[PDB]
Amino acid sequence: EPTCNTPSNRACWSDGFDINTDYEVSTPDTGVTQSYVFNLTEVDNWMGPDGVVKEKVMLINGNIMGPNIVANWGDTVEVTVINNLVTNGTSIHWHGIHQKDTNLHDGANGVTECPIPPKGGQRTYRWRARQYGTSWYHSHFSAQYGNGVVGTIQINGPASLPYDIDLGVFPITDYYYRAADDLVHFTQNNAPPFSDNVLINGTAVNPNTGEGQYANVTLTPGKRHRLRILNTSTENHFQVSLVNHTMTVIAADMVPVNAMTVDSLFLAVGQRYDVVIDASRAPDNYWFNVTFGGQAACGGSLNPHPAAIFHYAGAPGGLPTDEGTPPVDHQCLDTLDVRPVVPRSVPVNSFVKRPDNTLPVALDLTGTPLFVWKVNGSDINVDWGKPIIDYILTGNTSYPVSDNIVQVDAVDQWTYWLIENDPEGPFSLPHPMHLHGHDFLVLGRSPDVPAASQQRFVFDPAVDLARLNGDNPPRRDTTMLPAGGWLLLAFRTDNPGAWLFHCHIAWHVSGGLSVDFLERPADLRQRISQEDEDDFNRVCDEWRAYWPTNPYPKIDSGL
């Protein structure tokens, strides 16, 4: 753990480990393990934080969110998940945790494991904390995490800027009264709805009844505070800001970045931002605002002004008085100005669009249901009863077309992927793309234009090769795919396994927007221990025995 990490020197951690250490290839071994136990229950007619009683929710240990995972850079995190839901199977994915050589602990049901059966099923996840920062976890059993199976992850380590207080996690999520399975069914033939409310750190005031309450953050006058903001929504994409205050980003997702002071921030579904706010203003109460932009192209809420209160220690304690000015419209796009502390460099002068490096996203309105998302001609649909890893363990290469298997044999090399966002269809929407097992490099994207303008673009070397940047570009696990445009990413094949690459909007991945990167399959088998294998077969045997008795059918892709 830490020894030299002080308020005025956060760059220091322990001998041989600091903010400049390449955390991707060097990990401190503390020999320490942090354990947790997740009890999943299905609660009917549960009263929410704003006053409304939801029809049904799924909770980890009876709370709106699971427990905050907390550990030090280099420790081992272990979580026993006991599934006490009535019918649903379940899987907990650790969003942001690359799972280096531990693919079978990724929590991607139908891909790296069968779901943990209901009514008592259990399985223990175990992974090493090889990266420090802020992340989160959630179910991957369809849109289940929309009912409550979600929580945060805080792995301590160095920082690119000194600060006095670490305020901790600050999850911002959209909140719907209807249940995930109902919304999934609804979104298969209807446009997605606005969120009934937006929760800031678990709470919110009902805009109709006045019930509920504002999240209350207390700043220590004169001190610099670290705030870890996350967006754990199923659809809503946010914009945040603090009246009369700026924010200095020091981390994008779980990647530390050079200090970048901003006025507001756009956070896509699944993104995080570690910021340092300085209590240098007059003691008072200020509004922390959540606003939307991009003309509803990436979300909207029925609560016109979701917000929290930042109270200065010592000032009166009422509601803030200054409503402030609306932040700039970020047009459903994240900033590409972030520069990671630990650099990366990849050539882009030699890129060339090809069928095997291009992933065309399309919306198919000709079949059933109405809204079906496809990538390279197919809507993904995994088999909960026979994940891809089972094929790997049985020398079976007959992968069904539905699994959208994109095999990458390259050994520890940079791979380039151009994702095209339905440039030829009726209409295109912004899509937050996310990759399991790695942090990709955002080499570039189509020109920034209003998200609703419906302008289209198609990669054109004559103009775009000049727009690409491979000189330490933003590195992270989630970034925005411009509406009607394209996006060029890159990730190094340093981690054998089956990795999902999907859109994090629940409604979409559910509808099929996803592929499965089968990375270095030949090296994969040799690296799966007898234990992960046996337990894999164990959980799969229990799930296969259960399924036939399930009273419900699988309605979507299962992801």
Ligand SMILES: *[C@@H]1O[C@H](CO)[C@@H](O[C@@H]2O[C@H](CO)[C@@H](O[C@@H]3O[C@H](CO[C@H]4O[C@H](CO[C@@H]5O[C@H](CO)[C@@H](O)[C@H](O)[C@@H]5O)[C@@H](O)[C@H](O[C@H]5O[C@H](CO)[C@@H](O)[C@H](O)[C@@H]5O)[C@@H]4O)[C@@H](O)[C@H](O[C@H]4O[C@H](CO)[C@@H](O)[C@H](O)[C@@H]4O)[C@@H]3O)[C@H](O)[C@H]2NC(C)=O)[C@H](O)[C@H]1NC(C)=O
């Ligand atoms: C994991 O665990 C989950 C929790 O139990 C579980 O979810 C439940 O799944 C079951 C089965 O899939 C669901 O029940 C089915 O729901 C079907 C759809 O009903 C809902 O939508 C109706 C219309 O909504 C849309 O409307 C637009 C237009 O406006 C259309 O374009 C769109 O296509 C949709 O039609 C709506 O009328 C329903 O309202 C009722 O239910 C809701 C939710 O319970 C409630 O709030 C309302 O007040 C009202 O009671 C729903 O919103 C429905 O078609 C099914 O019924 C048909 O099929 C059965 C069997 O085939 C047949 O007997 C019937 O006669 C009928 O033909 C059925 O009711 C249930 O809603 C889910 N519960 C929740 C809370 O999410 C998961 O299934 C489980 N996962 C797995 C894999 O096990």
Ligand SMILES: *[C@@H]1O[C@H](CO)[C@@H](O[C@@H]2O[C@H](CO)[C@@H](O[C@@H]3O[C@H](CO)[C@@H](O)[C@H](O[C@H]4O[C@H](CO)[C@@H](O)[C@H](O)[C@@H]4O[C@H]4O[C@H](CO)[C@@H](O)[C@H](O)[C@@H]4O)[C@@H]3O)[C@H](O)[C@H]2NC(C)=O)[C@H](O)[C@H]1NC(C)=O
């Ligand atoms: C950050 O979050 C906080 C907390 O949620 C936000 O604070 C709220 O801010 C809104 C203002 O947008 C405020 O609502 C007003 O309350 C007044 C109470 O009397 C109303 O008079 C006022 O109504 C007018 O504005 C509405 C638009 O919001 C119109 O729909 C309505 O028709 C009214 O319009 C009149 O005035 C305009 C110009 O002034 C004129 O053109 C029209 O013809 C008409 O005459 C609002 O309802 C809440 O009271 C605030 N909540 C609290 C507890 O303070 C804050 O806005 C957020 N800040 C940012 C930057 O997002």
Ligand SMILES: *[C@@H]1O[C@H](CO)[C@@H](O[C@@H]2O[C@H](CO)[C@@H](O[C@@H]3O[C@H](CO)[C@@H](O)[C@H](O)[C@@H]3O)[C@H](O)[C@H]2NC(C)=O)[C@H](O)[C@H]1NC(C)=O
């Ligand atoms: C948000 O949380 C903060 C932190 O607890 C709350 O601040 C506290 O507010 C109360 C009053 O609202 C303060 O107490 C008051 O102090 C005055 C001065 O001594 C006294 O005259 C009053 O009778 C009362 O005791 C308290 O000091 C203050 N805490 C600090 C250290 O700032 C705030 O009220 C919360 N806001 C909301 C909307 O709930």
Ligand SMILES: *[C@@H]1O[C@H](CO)[C@@H](O[C@@H]2O[C@H](CO)[C@@H](O)[C@H](O)[C@H]2NC(C)=O)[C@H](O)[C@H]1NC(C)=O
């Ligand atoms: C998308 O699917 C197409 C099949 O239609 C794949 O394209 C083929 O790729 C192989 C290997 O590079 C080539 O030999 C064929 O000539 C390609 N066919 C076409 C359409 O020209 C493509 O690889 C898939 N893309 C991804 C990344 O999965």
Ligand SMILES: *[C@@H]1O[C@H](CO)[C@@H](O[C@@H]2O[C@H](CO)[C@@H](O)[C@H](O)[C@H]2NC(C)=O)[C@H](O)[C@H]1NC(C)=O
């Ligand atoms: C490889 O995996 C496939 C799954 O895609 C297996 O195919 C199934 O085999 C059973 C027979 O035991 C049939 O009842 C199913 O209908 C088959 N489904 C498909 C998709 O064909 C296959 O048996 C496995 N065997 C290999 C190739 O090793």
Ligand SMILES: *[C@@H]1O[C@H](CO)[C@@H](O)[C@H](O)[C@H]1NC(C)=O
């Ligand atoms: C989970 O919690 C519920 C109630 O909170 C309890 O009934 C059940 O026995 C618990 N399951 C386990 C094994 O923890």
Ligand SMILES: *[C@@H]1O[C@H](CO)[C@@H](O)[C@H](O)[C@H]1NC(C)=O
């Ligand atoms: C979020 O809420 C928890 C308890 O509900 C609190 O301990 C934490 O400090 C809050 N986050 C911040 C930084 O306000």
Ligand SMILES: [Cl-]
């Ligand atoms: Cl991930």
Ligand SMILES: [Cu+2]
């Ligand atoms: Cu995620």
Ligand SMILES: [Cu+2]
């Ligand atoms: Cu993930």
Ligand SMILES: [Cu+2]
């Ligand atoms: Cu999407």
Ligand SMILES: [Cu+2]
């Ligand atoms: Cu995922």
